[PDB]
Structure formats: C-alpha cells, structure tokens
C-alpha cells in the first residue's frame, strides 16, 4: 500500500543510486561511464536503494561478457558463455513497518571463473525482486556497464 | 505463469518434452530492447545452438527458436538444458 | 635443609589487549584474546626460599621470575625479576627485549598467611612483524601473498615491546591454507587473468 | 562487529552417504567445489548497510546437478587480504539437505 511497497533501484558507485543521472531510460540504461573495480576479483561496486521497510530480501543479478560480443544498437551483449552470479540484498526481514535500511552499498559478486578466458568486458545488472516480488522501481533497475574489465 | 526473477517466463519453463520435428518457443515478459542469447546445452556440455533473438518494444515476444529433430544434433535421444 | 612449602596457584593472565589498541581507528577495539594453551601457574620461585626451607608459609614474596603466556607456538613473558631489581620482559624470539629500572611492575606476594596465590594484570598493544606466505593460483586463481598476523606487544607505562607473532597467539585468527591471517597484515594479491597478470594489494 | 571486505562462503557439496551426518565431517571428495565471494556489509554505518547478512550462497552446478539427498559444508574462509572471521561457528553444515532439480 505504502506502509510497505517499496520502490528499489540500481545505480553505480561512480554516481549514487541515492540519485542516478538522467542518461537512464526507464526501458533500458546503459551507463555511459564505467565501473571502476578493485581488481582483486572483478567486483561491480555500486549502490542500490530500498526506501520503505522491505519484509522479504532480493537479488542483484549479474553476468560477465565479452565486449567483442556486444550489440551497441540496443544495449544487449550478444554472446559469451562464461560466468553468472548474483547478490543477496538484505535490509531486514521486518515484520511490517519499523525496520528499514535506506542506503545499501552492494559490491556485486562474480567469482568462480578460472578456466575460461578474460578480456575487455561488458556486464548487465538489474535490481531484481525475489521472483516476481513486491513492486520496485521509479528507475532504473537495469544497469548495463559498457566499460568493465574482467579479472579472474 | 511463473515469474522467474521478474521477467515472466512463459517459455521455456523447467520440464518440457519434445519430439521429432517439434519447436522450442521463446516468449518471455522482458523489459524493452532486450536480446536473449539462447544456449541449447546438449548432454555433452556444448551449445549445439546459439542464436540471438530480439524482443519487441512493449515487453513481449513470440518467437520460434530451434526446430528439434529437423536438424543434426537433435535427431537422437537425450536431455538438453536450454 | 629443605623443609615444608605451601604452594598452590599463582598469577592471573589477561586475555584482552588493554590500555592502547593499534586499531586503524584507535577508538574501537575487537575482542582480543591471547591464545589459551596457557598451561597455567606464573612460576613462583620464592625470593624468601630460606624462609620457605624453614617455616611453612606466611606472607611469602616471589621473584616474579615468570608469568606464563603459552599460545599455539612458543611463549612470552613479562616478569619482575626481583634478583635483577627490574622488569625483565622477554618475548617469543627468546630474548630480553626491555629492562625497566626499579619497581615499575608491582611485586607478586601472598595474600594471606598460609596460601600460595598471586596476582596478575597485563596491558598490551600490537606492533607488527610480517612474513610472506604464498597461496596457489589453483583455487580462486588470485594468488595471495600474505603477511604474518600482526605481532603481540606488551605495554608498560605507554611504551611498546614486541612479543612476536599474534598468529601464534591472538585468537581468533584464521587460516586459509595454513597462512596466518589477522589484524595488521597485507596481502599482495597477484591477480592472474586472461588479460595477463596484475598485482593489486589489499591491507588487512 | 564490522566486516566490510570480501570473504568467502566456500561451498563443498557431498551426498548424505558421502557425509558422516553425526560428526559433522566428510568421508569423501567434494562432488562439487565452488565459491561465493561474500563482500560483507560494514557495521560502521548501520544505515549505510546492515551487518546481518542473508547470503544466497552461489554455486555453478547445484542448479546443474540432479535432485537427491545432498549435504553441503559452508565454510567462512577469508579471500585472503580480508579481516578475521568466526569466534565460532566457523562453518554451517546442512546434514539433511534435499536438492531438487
């Protein structure tokens, strides 16, 4: 209703999900900048924002992809069977209203590739309900980093 | 139908049975300007069918993907993971 | 001739690093514990042996010639040796590392007439020494090059002395493939990818 | 207490007949080894994240491995370079788990 409801969005750590830049379509959003990683392992350092108490938890889906395999005319990587993963996002498991976390710094995980190549990478991300959850978004959920570099 | 991860899976759904000359369909509720790079992993761990399909500017799509039985690497038994 | 001696317990060991943490922010400290293979008894070799060798016990005094601080490996000690007249401090390397004039630790003495029990109270910081431990590229594929966990370091009057690796003492530590891992280290992570090989570093 | 950096819940998969399900220890080789780099949230700003995690422990073959009585040993081990864990448990073992694929 709006006791719990909760829009939830994805945006970079270069520019917060506290407030994202107006280069984001609602139907897409290729970030025209970069993830700047820490190269320990390739780690999509970002923010996510959840506003209201969120009683369930949810996902920040993630997939590593070659940039040689990219379609830049619709913002969709075209191939690369490599590795996929996703993050848990907990706020709290709140029993109604009174338990919220406004800013959640999410350093998205991908790791466990170690027998398949690395190169110059593109990676799609998305604020993702748990399996058709509660209603998120005043946008963007969808975050396609045009500049990533993979390290295994 | 099951709404896997927010995109409404209408097809494929987990557990689908196919015969000689029968069709894999792709219909999923995406967010617009989406491609699906679709990988038919055979039981020998190989993508005998990689193909890139385009969703429409609305959220939907009804696409025919791969014709199983009518192509080599589908003419004899066994389990795939699309 | 050696005659009757009453001896029972002895000192008390502390299991937190107190009165100056070496935490990256000084305000904050996590729950240090010196490792508790402490075989027990701060060894109580009497000053007044000749008294021991005659009269049974009364209020009895000690060269505080040891305070046991055993861990995973070796031991360290902070011991007021009443036959030098100064605070002898030893470490796990083996050596006297400081020697502090007069009384600047209090004397262990008996608390009663007929007893064998003594006190103990100790205050530490950490000053690190480090030593690389190599971890394979057959796991995560990010070869970790990991410096030794911190190093315990006693303090008396605000002055610090190395008591040696805190990965043979301070618990909890952890091990990944037998690599001592815990506060005030660094791992040089040699990140070997299909791009080549970079080398980042992560401080602990 | 705060942990901001990367550790991992190391997932080692087993059967219930590859696990002595009373003593909490394996009696065989992993039937899958995979890792989940858990960039755990700081306690330094409870407001900026919460230090009580839910982790969706990730594995690359246990949605690709078949239905059956599985046992998984989930180990808190630092991806080295990261702070200490575990004033104990250091692990969680599910000893009556059931995969369904």
Query: What is the distance of C-alpha D47 from the center of its chain?
Result: 26
DSSP structural state of residue A139: S
Please state, as a whole number, how many other Cβ atoms lie within 10 Å of the Cβ of residue B73. Answer: 13
Place of tokens 């305000």: C27
CA–CA separation, B44 vs B25, rounded Å? 23
CA–CA separation, A103 vs A101, rounded Å? 6
CA–CA separation, B48 vs B40, rounded Å? 6
How many angstroms away from the CA of C26 is the closest CA of chain A?
A: 25
Beta-bridge partner residues of C187:
C146, C202
Residue C78 is inside which H or E element, if any? strand C75-81
Hey, is C3 helix, strand or coil? coil
Beta-bridge partner residues of C192:
C197
CA–CA separation, C111 vs C135, rounded Å? 52
D26: left (phi over 0), alpha (psi -120 to 50) or beta: beta
Please state, as a whole number, how many other Cβ atoms lie within 10 Å of the Cβ of residue C121. Answer: 12
DSSP structural state of residue C106: P
Picking from C129, C150, C187, C179, the residue whose alpha carbon sits closest to that of residue C17 is C150
Place of tokens 């705060």: D2
What lies within 8 Å, CB to CB, of C81 at 6+ separation is C63, C64, C65, C87, C88
Q: CB–CB of A83/A42 below 8 Å?
A: no
Nearest CB to C191: which of A40, A116, A119? A40
**Please, what is the Cα angle at A17 between A96 and D53, to 5 degrees?**
50
Determination method here?
cryo-EM
Nearest 10 degrees: CA dihedral of B35, B41, B45, B51?
A: -40
Hey, is C200 helix, strand or coil? coil
Tell me the residue ranges of DSSP E strands in chain B. 8-11, 22-29, 35-41, 47-54, 63-68
Q: Flag if A129 and B6 touch (Cβ within 8 Å).
A: yes
Q: Outline where chain C has alpha helix (H).
A: 49-52
Q: CB–CB of D78/D35 below 8 Å?
A: no
Q: CB–CB of A85/A111 below 8 Å?
A: yes
Place of tokens 């969706």: D56
Q: Flag if A111 and D47 touch (Cβ within 8 Å).
A: no
Picking from C164, C162, C135, C130, the residue whose alpha carbon sits closest to that of residue C148 is C130
Q: CB–CB of D15/D69 below 8 Å?
A: yes
Q: CB–CB of D46/D4 below 8 Å?
A: no
Nearest CB to B33: which of A59, A76, A128? A76
Q: CB–CB of A60/D33 below 8 Å?
A: no
Take residue B77 and report the two structure tokens written for it. Answer: 């038994």
DSSP codes joined into one string, chain D: ----SEEEEEEEEEESSSEETTTTEESS--SEEE--EEEPPPSS-TTS--S--------SSSSSS-SB-EEEEEEEE--SSS----SS--EEEESS--B--
Please state, as a whole number, how many other Cβ atoms lie within 10 Å of the Cβ of residue C25. Answer: 8
CA–CA separation, A111 vs D11, rounded Å? 13
D17: left (phi over 0), alpha (psi -120 to 50) or beta: alpha
How many angstroms away from the CA of B56 is the closest CA of chain A?
A: 11
CA–CA separation, A101 vs A83, rounded Å? 30
Chain B neighbors (3+ CB pairs < 8 Å): A
Resolution given for this structure, in angstroms: 11.2
Beta-bridge partner residues of D19:
D26
Q: Flag if A111 and D35 touch (Cβ within 8 Å).
A: yes
Take residue C88 and report the two structure tokens written for it. Answer: 């002898």
């Amino acid at each position: 209703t709006a006791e719990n409801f909760t829009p939830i969005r994805l945006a970079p750590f270069q520019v917060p999900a506290q407030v994202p830049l107006p280069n984001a379509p609602k139907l897409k959003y290729e970030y025209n900048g970069s993830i700047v990683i820490t190269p320990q392992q390739q780690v999509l350092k970002i923010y996510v924002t959840s506003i209201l108490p969120y009683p369930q938890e949810f996902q920040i889906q993630a997939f590593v992809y070659e940039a040689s395999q990219f379609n830049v005319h619709t913002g969709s990587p075209t191939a690369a069977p490599v590795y996929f993963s996703y993050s848990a996002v907990r706020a709290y498991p709140a029993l109604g209203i009174g338990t919220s976390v406004p800013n959640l710094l999410v350093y998205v995980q991908l790791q466990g590739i170690s027998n398949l190549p690395a190169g110059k990478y593109v990676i799609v991300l998305s604020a993702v309900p748990f399996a058709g959850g509660p209603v998120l978004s005043e946008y963007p959920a969808q975050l396609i980093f045009t500049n990533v570099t993979l390290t295994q | 139908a099951v709404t896997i991860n927010g995109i409404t899976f209408y097809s494929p759904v987990p557990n689908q049975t196919y015969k000689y000359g029968q069709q894999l369909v792709l219909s999923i509720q995406s967010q617009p300007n989406a491609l699906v790079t679709l990988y038919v992993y055979d039981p020998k761990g190989n993508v005998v069918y990689n193909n890139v399909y385009q969703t429409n500017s609305s959220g939907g799509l009804t696409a025919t993907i791969a014709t199983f039985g009518s192509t080599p690497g589908f003419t004899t038994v066994g389990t795939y993971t699309v | 001739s050696t005659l009757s001696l009453v001896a029972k317990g002895a000192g008390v060991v502390e299991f937190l690093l107190t009165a100056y943490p070496y935490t990256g922010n000084i305000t904050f400290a996590p729950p240090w514990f010196i490792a508790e293979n402490v075989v027990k008894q701060p060894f109580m070799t009497y000053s007044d042996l000749q008294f021991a060798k005659t009269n049974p016990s009364a209020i009895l005094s000690l060269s505080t010639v040891n305070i046991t601080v055993v861990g995973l490996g070796g031991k360290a000690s902070v011991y007021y040796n009443s036959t030098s007249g100064q605070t002898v401090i030893t470490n796990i390397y083996g050596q006297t590392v400081a020697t502090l004039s007069g009384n600047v630790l209090p004397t262990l003495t008996e608390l009663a007439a007929g007893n064998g029990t003594f006190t103990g109270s100790l205050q530490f910081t950490i000053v690190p020494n480090n030593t690389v431990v190599q971890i394979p590229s057959s796991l995560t594929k990010t070869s970790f090059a990991v410096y030794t966990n911190g190093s315990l370091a006693i303090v008396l009057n605000g002055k610090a002395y190395s008591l040696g690796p805190a990965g043979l003492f301070l618990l909890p530590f952890v091990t990944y493939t037998g690599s001592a891992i815990g506060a005030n280290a660094t791992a040089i992570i040699t990140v070997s990818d299909g791009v080549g090989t970079s080398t980042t570093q992560v401080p602990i």
